[PDB]
Amino acid sequence: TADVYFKRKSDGKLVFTAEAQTASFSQAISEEKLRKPLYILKSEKEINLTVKNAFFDLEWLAMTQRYEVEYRIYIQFPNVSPSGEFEMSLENGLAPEIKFEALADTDTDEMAVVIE
Amino acid sequence: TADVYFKRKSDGKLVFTAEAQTASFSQAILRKPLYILKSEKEINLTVKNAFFDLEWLAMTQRYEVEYRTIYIQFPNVSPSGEFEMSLENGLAPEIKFEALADTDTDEMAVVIE
Amino acid sequence: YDYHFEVNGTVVRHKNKGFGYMERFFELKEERSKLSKKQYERFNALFNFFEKNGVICMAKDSIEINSLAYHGKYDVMKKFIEEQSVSIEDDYKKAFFLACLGRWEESYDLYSNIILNSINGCVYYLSQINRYRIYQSITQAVTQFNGLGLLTFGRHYKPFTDEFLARIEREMTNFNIDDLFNGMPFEFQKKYKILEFLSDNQFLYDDTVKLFELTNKVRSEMSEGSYSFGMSSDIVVLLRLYDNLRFLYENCLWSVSFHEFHQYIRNSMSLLIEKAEYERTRDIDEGFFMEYYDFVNISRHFKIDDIKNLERSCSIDKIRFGEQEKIEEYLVGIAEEITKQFSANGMNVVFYTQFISEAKAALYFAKYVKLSEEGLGKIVKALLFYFPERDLDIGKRYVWLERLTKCNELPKSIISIIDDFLVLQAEKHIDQNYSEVSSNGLYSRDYGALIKHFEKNFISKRLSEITLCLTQDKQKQIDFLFKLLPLLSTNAKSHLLSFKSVENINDLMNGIRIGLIDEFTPEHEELIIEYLETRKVNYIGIQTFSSNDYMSTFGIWYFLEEINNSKMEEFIGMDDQYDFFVDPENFDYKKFIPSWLKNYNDKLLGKIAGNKHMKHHVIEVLKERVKNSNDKRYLEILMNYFI
Amino acid sequence: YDYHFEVNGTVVRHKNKGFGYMERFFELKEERSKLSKKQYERFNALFNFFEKNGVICMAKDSIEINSLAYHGKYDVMKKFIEEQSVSIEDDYKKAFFLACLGRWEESYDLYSNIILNSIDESNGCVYYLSQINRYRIYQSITQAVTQFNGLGLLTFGRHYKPFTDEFLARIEREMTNFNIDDLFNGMPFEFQKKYKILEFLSDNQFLYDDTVKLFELTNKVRSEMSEGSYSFGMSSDIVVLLRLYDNLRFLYENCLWSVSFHEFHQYIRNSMSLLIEKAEYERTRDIDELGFFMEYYDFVNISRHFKIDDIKNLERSCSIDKIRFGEQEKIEEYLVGIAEEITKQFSANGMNVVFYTQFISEAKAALYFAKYVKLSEEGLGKIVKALLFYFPERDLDIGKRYVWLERLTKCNELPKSIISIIDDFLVLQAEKHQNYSEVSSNGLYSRDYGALIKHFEKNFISKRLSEITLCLTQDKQKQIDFLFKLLPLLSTNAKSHLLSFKSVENINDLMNGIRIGLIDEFTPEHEELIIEYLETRKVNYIGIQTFSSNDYMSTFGIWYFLEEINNSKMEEFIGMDDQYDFFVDPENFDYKKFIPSWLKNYNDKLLGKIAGNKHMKHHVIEVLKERVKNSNDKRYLEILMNYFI
């Protein structure tokens, strides 16, 4: 049981906090045929994360009317895109689970950082 | 979608007739001399829609089976007596039987074309 | 319960102790003149009903779903909507249709009016169920937009007026869903017994339990290898699936669009493909193909991760893809819908949330169909220009495009769409803040590489014009067009290279990727060695491991003799996949990770095999991975080059 | 629905809008002296209840099942039954135990009597539970009677009639038009408002909620194992196990007969065998750049609610030898108890049929899974003696019982006592042989027991079989050629006496002589016999085609391949079946008829020789790569890394 902290990329404001449930780390090559020359070491790096119980910051909700995530060993994803897929159950609902995918900037070309 | 006839081995009387559902034939391998080709071979058959012969039912109150599609004959079929009850009432009886093999004859099943 | 009615359509005498009415009825169906005239008039209707639904004949002796909602005819449903409803049944059809294209408010109002105007009696029951379901949809949509909507869309939408929400909260309170069948006339309860299961808040549990039992039976047959001769559990699964689809969609129930039904589909489907694929891997001892209805099912009820897992488990590109024309017009409808929506005036957010998952799934899993040039072109135009940025990032939308590229090779028309998409991306690269970020890690340079791979002589006119227009002021456009150098003309190449310098490591990677660098000049050795000096300096009680993946590239370059300067051994010890390639002998392979072997290509893998001083440890790794896992790619590596 | 309760022991806030009661209650549990004396005593009662059922705290911050029926204390329940019940509460568990031991008539009558005496019950919970269990007994009796009129005739040969005709008539009579779906509704409204949570018990399908939840959890676990994702909080597998143990403890502690129905066993076998698969996936999981062990309770669950074919399927799907086995003493005690029951019943006048169907199905799974647990010498002696002599042969024949025995032999090497027991069994089999045939579904006849004995001793000489051989006469053929297959067990004088009448007339005797080791090289007589049988086989072959599993033909082909046959007449017999042309002339086999299943049957020496042919290696390597890429058997792959055939 470990927690994640959501921040806006611009400032230090807390977007929301949650507890990480599952993290899908499945990264491999792309299609070999489609992509003598100097080796580039192509990759299709993907990291997905899911959080079970997330409550958004009250100040964040009040102000709302690029994101960073800090999963506490502590790891940081400088850019995370929340996949806002809303699927609804006929059972009345409740556990708001948020899934987000890490992103890599062209210049930085780094997706996640793991530090003790 | 063929038909299967369960017969008494000695008398030859038809114990019952049913429609085949499932058949498993899985033969696989502590157990310098001459290679004897020892093997552990089994055949299980689950059959559906079995209604027993009325004459055999009246008489009862080794087996051989013939499964005809091309043409299969299993001698020495032992009916497994597993019985499990569903809380939902009961829908047809399903009969499971295993193919037996004699030491002298050393054959398990025959296929006729 | 007098008779057993199953999926295939054969009646089974189950608990009828009296005279057999079904057997005699079927004998009469297969001498009706002796029947009374009024009795025969009823019999013709019974024949029509019993042949429209199934019930072909006795046990001893293809699916069609006709609804504009199932087929996604999002324009025909509108045209039906503005037409005046002749009767209450057509009005309830319009209710379901109105609930389909978003707009839960109008569908809820219409359901309420149908409730007041109903005085058969089953139309009221179905409308009560659908109104409760529509209120549930509006409530969870409100919760999602209030909670997650702000983070996802970046702004608060509030698709529904507060007065509407208050009124629906007041009206649906004290309405027990399970009660609603019990509190209706005894005549209806006696006649419409089969609808009782729809009354409760959970009506797929019986279907889900039967599907669990059937899936477990199918898995037992798969593992054991037994042969099923009669009506198989697999065909039972698919036929019960089709029964549920044709019962829920045709009867105009919104309960189809819920997570439970979606997840029931996702279990019942994708168990047919697993069994079908295993059927091809049947061990010989002493087929199933996908139709337009199947395409709609997977496009509707499968999440992108779900179809990804389906692809991992089974090779789905081998199963025959029939009814291709129907599939193609289906994705043509999807593409025209998304273009019409997002081309002008934003989108319908309630429509957006319901439809974007289906659009994403269909466009992703379209890898396996052959689309004509016009259909492929419009699909690509919808995919690149008009698909929302939030759902498809540059790399992931590129993956969608390159997956569409599998079945159909790139035509000139599609290359033009990629070209002006790249031109638009270059246009957006003006403000210094903007930088295309992708979850996949791949970018517009990959679009350029795709174009060059499929033509090898393409020259992009507009990007070359912008390149001739470039000045030193706009550095973002400069190092964006740097990644698109092969697309540019030779004059554009010179104009871009005038301001382009290899200042940092990433610039050298871009230069290598575009092909500007074919042999390392000593300045590149100096830059790489200086960067490694900096990495060692910042390394020297906590240690960092990032996903930059540059140190591994340097190590592999040293291994493949591309770099011929023996200062690399100083940097040995920081991160792995570097010592493995620089000095494989003293690598202490207890730290070796098998996944690295996925990242290598044919040339690198062949060189690793040919090293012969690190061959044995890696062959052990490949062996224990192929024994442990079912990935089937580690075995491909293990046997293509025996590494 | 005001609060939501997780299986972990934590409570979560959903729906209660007023003042929060359990929020204050848990903090009070963690100055409570300020309450009233009556408040204090009821708070004590609650505290006892909530920590009894596992509700520990809220979300912000193993199991035991105390029941004799779950542990199979099949004599202690008898002792409970004989004892007079002081109260109806003790009478409910006595009726449950009566049900668990067959004896469904007495269970039905006792349940009816509890129903009669439950008029003055304070709450009526025992009345409703007795009604449910009486209906369960009634359908159990109905299905058992249907089986005995059906499967009970094929099996058992005879008609049993465990329940009298008058008893059946009355129970059909009072049970007529009885809707269990109405039973909870046909109760006083005080009972319904108080025992609302027993409503799911009412309907004729009460595990559908649990089965659907298990389906969802299994799908999620499969999604994680396919994606390779890592669960950090409470894993879905842990949730499966927790709901598992909660369900077993609920329907075993409260004495419900519905635990003994096929639906519950299916729920168990699907909820289990998924934790095992998840554990095996966890073990075989590659490290990226960024264990589960079964207990005595799990052993009991697998022993009871798993069929033999289903355990076979799960061991095929995942390896279990790498899963460590704890609580081995309790598992040994349970297995010894099961063996003790089967011995005390079959050894003395047989055992009642109604309890037989319930007991023996789980006895199969217990003895089959006994391979994996480590057992003491006395326990192994008891269980082997139970499986050989006092186990009903109608289910595990000689071949399958031998497989059982070698399975319990895998973990623990054979001690002298077990070999003495097998010697007694072989003596009994020898004296059984009359026009009696040792038929088996497995094909591993009594000679395999002697082979195991010699494998674990290499010097064992069976005295009693030796004396039997000394007293053998030429009139009795079945015993003589039965002991011919048991030749290594006999003494030298017994061997000499048996060889007097033992002749290789047909090639089956040649197989028996080879297996016992009497023949180490082919004399010209043996070669001539083989050629003659091949001549008559082709003569009868030529005329529809017939394929049999006699397999002698493939044995001849393999003998030709291994150069053990050195007569060049075999090529005349080419074409009558496959796997013979495969070995005699591998170059001209036209491998479109090759069957990949053959390589599993061959041993190390045979496939090593096949590897060294090199005029035939490439076709079989193509077959092997196809099978390894397609199938997940992992035996073809093991063959591949072993010698790349």
Author numbering:
A (entry chain G): 8 to 42, 48 to 77, 170 to 176, 191 to 211, 214 to 236
B (entry chain H): 8 to 36, 41 to 42, 48 to 77, 170 to 177, 191 to 211, 214 to 236
C (entry chain D): 336 to 365, 369 to 399, 406 to 463, 467 to 633, 644 to 897, 903 to 1005
D (entry chain C): 336 to 365, 369 to 399, 406 to 634, 644 to 786, 789 to 897, 903 to 1005
Verbatim from the authors:
The recently identified bacterial Sir2 domain-containing protein, defense-associated sirtuin 2 (DSR2), recognizes the phage tail tube and depletes NAD+ to abort phage propagation, which is counteracted by the phage-encoded DSR anti-defense 1 (DSAD1), but their molecular mechanisms remain unclear. DSR2 contains an N-terminal Sir2 domain that serves as an NADase effector responsible for NAD+ hydrolysis, a C-terminal domain (CTD) that functions as a sensor for detecting invading phages (as discussed later), and a middle domain (MID) that connects the Sir2 effector and the CTD sensor. DSR2 forms a tetramer with its C-terminal sensor domains (CTDs) in two distinct conformations: CTDclosed or CTDopen. Monomeric, rather than oligomeric, tail tube proteins preferentially bind to CTDclosed and activate Sir2 for NAD+ hydrolysis.
